[PDB]
């Protein structure tokens, strides 16, 4: 039912741009490895 396909190789791109933020949020894990908000 599942097939695979080549995409890329593990490499750090020096020409990449910076985005995103760095906040601190309280997580509460679960048995299935999920996440929630404490």
């Amino acid at each position: 039912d599942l097939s695979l396909e080549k995409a890329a190789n593990v490499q750090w791109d020096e020409m990449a741009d910076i985005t995103g933020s760095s906040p601190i949020i309280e997580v509460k894990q679960d048995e299935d490895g999920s996440f929630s908000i404490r």
Partner: protein, 55 residues
Amino acid sequence: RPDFCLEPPYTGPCKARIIRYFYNAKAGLCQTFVYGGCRAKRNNFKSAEDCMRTC
């Protein structure tokens, strides 16, 4: 029909793409939505059958 059929289709906080079925409470039938992989609500079926049978 159950009270979780109330709920809109819920793509969870995971980033996979697993096509599932939700009971539309808008139109009156069942139809596909994208499931994330984790934290599935009850309004989430692996087939159009189960969705139509439950609701």
